[PDB]
């Protein structure tokens, strides 16, 4: 039906003319937009191995090209369909083909390996075990072709992709330098996939983020936060937000690049995804020392966080709430004063009637920091009464705290009781 007998005949014919004819018939039939017939070509036991064998024909450049195209498309399907390609032995042949004299061939080779490594952690690590990156990284030495550089950075991103489990870090870490100078390219696709690779490598312990910091990319990452195309801004924001998951020294590295300035702009972006990830980045920042909190203050971020907390979608409001709560946990007595001056009590109180229990606890401790500080200001005893006990009451705060007595969660209920007794 879909695969005429003429095709298989020519495929196993020893005439290169007919070999090529049938191979490109397969190629065309696999370039179908809706659903190419991958299961149909796999159901003919001896064709996939036949294509693998065609890949070794250095004599003919066109034949390896068409066969690699066929195999890429087969490798673009389900996990079983690419396991067919793998256990047919195509990965080492493709890697050897990276060093080919013919440019079309090596482009298709890196594309095939990108699909294969983009399968799963097992395929990714298997392609790594075949020494893919030493010949893959030399491909960037030729800044001549663009399509090739795109395919190469995308395959790299696949090699870094995956967190369950992460790739062997020593196996993929040597690509950090090439990514480091790949951020200064003009093309948006290469920048986007380079930022994705950096975002994957930055997801891990402080050691891995310290390595990528030692690659010297934070400055260009933050400069890409202001990119016009969101295909670039999304992964760049993700990579920066990963770096700021480290200790104070390595997040201070991001701050020294003047990143808060552009994060403020991203707090107004129409895409709620970017708003959310920027709020998350800023929350991690405000979990640090008093100086990092203060540079968030001097960047005029908390006005925007309070606004976002009032009007944004709940997914975003969560990260905004974490931001201001973190600022209240380890902040100066004057910094939280700036916060309550800005009027953060009403948003936090507004967050108590919500379904999510964990961020209700967030708002609770963020209010308890203000209450405890206010009690500490009352400890001075210039005035006996806690000044914030009235400001939280004017916001209908203790009303919702009282309602939190009947809350199912024992943690929330008990905390509400402690607060109402200690401060009221």
């Amino acid at each position: 039906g879909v695969i005429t007998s003429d095709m298989i005949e020519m495929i196993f014919s020893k005439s290169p003319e007919q070999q090529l004819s049938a191979t490109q018939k397969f190629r065309k039939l696999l370039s179908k937009e809706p659903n190419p017939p991958i299961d149909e070509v796999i159901s003919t036991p001896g064709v996939v191995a036949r294509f693998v064998e065609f890949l070794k024909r250095k004599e003919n450049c066109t034949l390896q090209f068409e066969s690699a195209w066929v195999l890429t498309n087969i490798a673009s399907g389900n996990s079983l369909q690419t396991r067919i390609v793998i256990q047919a032995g195509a990965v080492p042949i493709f890697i050897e083909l990276l060093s080919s004299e013919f440019e079309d061939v090596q482009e298709q080779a890196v594309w095939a390996l990108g699909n294969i490594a983009g399968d799963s952690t097992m395929c990714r690590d298997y392609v790594l075990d075949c020494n893919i990156l030493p010949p893959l990284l030399q491909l960037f030495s030729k800044q001549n072709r663009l399509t090739m550089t795109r395919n190469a950075v995308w395959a790299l991103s696949n090699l870094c992709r995956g967190k369950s489990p992460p790739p062997e870090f020593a196996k993929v870490s040597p690509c950090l330098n090439v990514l480091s100078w790949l951020l200064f390219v003009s093309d948006t696709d290469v920048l986007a996939d380079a930022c994705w690779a950096l975002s994957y490598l930055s997801d891990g312990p402080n050691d891995k983020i310290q390595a990528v910091i030692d690659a010297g990319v934070c400055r260009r990452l933050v400069e890409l936060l202001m990119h016009n195309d969101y295909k670039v801004v999304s992964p760049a924001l993700r990579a920066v937000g990963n770096i700021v998951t480290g200790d104070d020294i390595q997040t201070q590295v991001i701050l020294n690049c003047s990143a808060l300035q552009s994060l403020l702009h991203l707090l107004s972006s129409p895409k709620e995804s970017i708003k959310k990830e920027a709020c998350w980045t800023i929350s991690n920042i405000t979990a640090g020392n008093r100086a990092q909190i203060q540079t968030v203050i001097d960047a005029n971020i908390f006005p925007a966080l309070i606004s976002i907390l009032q009007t944004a979608e709940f997914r975003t409001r969560k990260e905004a709430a974490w931001a201001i709560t973190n600022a209240t946990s380890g902040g100066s007595a004057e910094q939280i004063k700036y916060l309550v001056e800005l009027g953060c009590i009403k948003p936090l109180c507004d967050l108590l009637t919500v379904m999510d229990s964990k961020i209700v606890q967030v708002a609770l401790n963020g209010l308890e920091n203000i209450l405890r500080l206010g009690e500490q200001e009352a400890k001075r005893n210039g005035t006996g009464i806690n000044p914030y006990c009235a400001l939280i009451e004017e916001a209908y705060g203790l009303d919702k705290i009282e309602f939190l007595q009947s809350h199912e969660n024992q943690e929330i209920y008990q905390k509400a009781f402690d607060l109402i007794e200690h401060y009221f």
Binding site: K32, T72, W111, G114, N158, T245, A287
Partner: peptide, 15 residues
């Protein structure tokens, strides 16, 4: 310490 962490294939067509 207080930090919260975060929480593939291309088909080729001539057309």
């Amino acid at each position: 310490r207080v930090k919260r962490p975060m929480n593939r294939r291309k088909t080729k067509t001539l057309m």
